Amino acid sequence: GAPATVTEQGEDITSKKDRGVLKIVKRVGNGEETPMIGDKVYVHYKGKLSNGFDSSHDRNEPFVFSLGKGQVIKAWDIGVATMKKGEIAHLLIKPEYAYGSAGSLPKIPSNATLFFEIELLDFKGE
Numbered sequence: 001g002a003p004a005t006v007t008e009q010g011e012d013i014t015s016k017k018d019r020g021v022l023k024i025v026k027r028v029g030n031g032e033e034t035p036m037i038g039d040k041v042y043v044h045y046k047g048k049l050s051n052g053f054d055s056s057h058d059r060n061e062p063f064v065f066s067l068g069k070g071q072v073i074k075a076w077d078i079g080v081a082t083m084k085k086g087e088i089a090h091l092l093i094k095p096e097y098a099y100g101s102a103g104s105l106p107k108i109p110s111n112a113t114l115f116f117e118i119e120l121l122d123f124k125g126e
């Protein structure tokens with residue numbers, strides 16, 4: 001399924017090249033611009049423990065957050081910063097770029113690998 005595909009074929013978009021954040025572009029977007037730190041970002045997302053979703057659709061509204069402001073896990077700040085408007089991307093994320101050894105119960109156990117599908121709807125400058 002989609003997580004194994006990202007393990008097998010995903011790009012490593014981490015600076016350290018530790019495979020902590022792996023990406024596949026599943027639908028291409030438009031525009032020379034990706035979001036940069038500070039931007040308000042609008043997404044729809046499906047996310048799940050890679051073991052086997054929480055989704056923005058469940059709540060019938062987009063998920064809204066400021067990039068690089070620590071409002072989302074590291075893997076999002078890194079991953080979404082690579083995405084173009086209208087893009088759909090799959091991310092697979094080792095715990096070091098999500099909730100770590102501590103976890104975040106009850107939803108996230110210690111040392112959890114996470115998978116998302118993200119659609120970048122829009123972004124606006126600070």
Ligand SMILES: COc1cc2cc(c1OC)OC[C@H](C)OC/C=C/[C@H](O)[C@@H](C)OC(=O)[C@@H]1CCCCN1C(=O)[C@H]2C1CCCCC1
Nearest residue numbers: 045047048049053054063065071072073076104107108114
């Ligand atoms: C660990 O806590 C949660 C994790 C996740 C979703 C949670 C959640 O309860 C606070 O509830 C949904 C509400 C709307 O979210 C508000 C804020 C989310 C924040 O931005 C943080 C907590 O979430 C994140 O940084 C990431 C990325 C953005 C979307 C939420 N995500 C999650 O880790 C999900 C998580 C995904 C794996 C399946 C279980 C839910």
